[PDB]
């Protein structure tokens, strides 16, 4: 490998081939794994030179080597990506998107993906410089399978970073302009094109209901549910995030997830061996039990209440807390027949056993749930049987000990419960 000093002596020559040799040497340094000397390359003042090499059309080799070098600089810290942008690289990379050499156009796609991935500001700056039009033009073919696999994966990933950050979210006109192509990629067969396309949809559905609706109006929910039952984990994870985001919106958007058959997949998702899949599936369930009664009923029909009892009985404490939320939402919006069915499935014992947890928020959520359950018992006139049950499993001892607690809202709800029943 060359020294930073030698790379500078060559790039500063007036010999295009001496400059090509040096730029290739710079690329090979930045493409090493151990501590790529990014900061040393920047102090040398080479970025403005690489940016200008992007424009030498009569020397394709120096365009590729400088694009590769700049791609890796822009992959580092926010300060290092800023240096690439401050050098004028953005309009230069957009121009390279139309290069007749595919490997150079691919490299420009990659570099712009790293720039837009920094955050909202650079993402919007890449969009203002007009990158979306030429990007989508690269995917305007009758069949995506005619495109090179790696070419297609870089395009999908870069598009994902143009739909990613928040505060603010990407411009509405940009999202509308990208979605038709994003939906085509969501039906492609490549696992990575699908995973990065599910991450993009995951980002666009993280926000207000106006953003959710725009995605759900393109009819991608059936396809998301299909991917939700995929064998590969990297596809199930973003597919579930998008599904979980969609159910934070209106009850009609939640209903489209139910109609696509999403609840049939949750027996597996709620017993998935991955802690993170189990937690996100439970979180999604908690937002579904917060919907209508006919929607709580559809949770019951699919046999998911026993699975919630199971997750509440044993799982990572964070998955357990999401299940506690799913029960409190279930009990607060459900009918009487639905709340007693919750007791027949055995919710009380694991719900009580979790009152020994060292977290104040879950205690409030559980106690509230118990209040909703007791309120439904008042309606059937069997408040007596339920209280014999909470006592036979040892729950009262916990409730009456919750009296002596630090927080005030716990003390009041706890006392109020032992006084009423």
């Amino acid at each position: 490998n060359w020294s930073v000093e030698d790379i500078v002596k060559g790039i500063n020559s007036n010999n295009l081939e001496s400059q090509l040799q040096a730029t290739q040497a710079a690329r090979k340094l930045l493409s090493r794994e151990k501590q790529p000397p990014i900061d040393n390359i920047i102090r040398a003042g080479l970025i403005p030179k690489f940016v200008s090499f992007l424009g030498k059309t009569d020397c394709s080799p120096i365009q590729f080597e400088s694009a590769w070098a700049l791609t890796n600089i822009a992959s580092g810290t926010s300060e290092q990506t800023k240096a690439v942008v401050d050098g004028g690289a953005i309009p230069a990379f957009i121009s390279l998107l139309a290069s007749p050499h595919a490997h150079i156009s691919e490299q420009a796609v990659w570099a712009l993906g790293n720039i837009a991935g920094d955050g909202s500001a650079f993402r919007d700056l890449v969009i203002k410089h007009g990158a979306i039009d030429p990007l989508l033009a690269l995917l305007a073919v009758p069949d995506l399978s005619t495109l090179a696999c790696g070419y297609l994966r870089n395009l999908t990933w870069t598009l994902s970073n143009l739909c990613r950050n928040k505060n603010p979210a990407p411009p509405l006109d940009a999202v509308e302009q990208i979605l038709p192509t994003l939906v085509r990629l969501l039906h492609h067969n490549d696992p990575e094109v699908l995973a990065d396309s599910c991450w993009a949809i995951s980002y666009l559905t993280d926000g207000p209901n106006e953003r959710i609706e725009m995605v759900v109006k393109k009819g991608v929910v059936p396809q998301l549910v299909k991917l939700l039952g995929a064998t590969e984990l990297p596809i199930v994870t973003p597919a579930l995030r998008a599904i979980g985001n969609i159910v934070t919106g209106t009850d009609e958007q939640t209903q489209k997830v139910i109609d696509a058959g999403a609840l049939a997949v949750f027996p597996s998702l709620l017993t998935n061996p991955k802690t993170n899949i189990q937690k996100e599936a439970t979180w999604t369930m908690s937002n579904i039990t917060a919907g209508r009664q006919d929607q709580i009923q559809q949770v019951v029909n699919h046999g998911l209440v026993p699975f919630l009892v199971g997750v509440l009985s044993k799982a990572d404490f964070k998955t357990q807390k999401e299940a506690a939320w799913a029960i409190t939402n279930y009990t607060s919006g459900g009918t009487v027949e639905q709340i007693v069915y919750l007791v027949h499935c055995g919710i009380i014992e694991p719900l009580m056993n979790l009152l020994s947890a060292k977290d104040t928020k879950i205690i409030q959520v559980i106690l509230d749930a118990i209040s909703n359950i007791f309120q439904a018992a008042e309606k059937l006139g069997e408040t007596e049987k339920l209280s014999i049950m909470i006592e036979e499993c040892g729950g009262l001892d916990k409730i009456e000990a919750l009296q002596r607690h630090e927080n005030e809202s716990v003390y009041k709800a706890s006392l109020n419960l032992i006084e009423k029943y």
């Binding site: 493409s31 794994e33 790529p36 590769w68 992959s75 490299q107 990659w110 920094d118 990933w157």
Partner: peptide, 6 residues
């Protein structure tokens, strides 16, 4: 977020 080419 950001990826290098090695």
């Amino acid at each position: 977020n950001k990826k290098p080419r090695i």
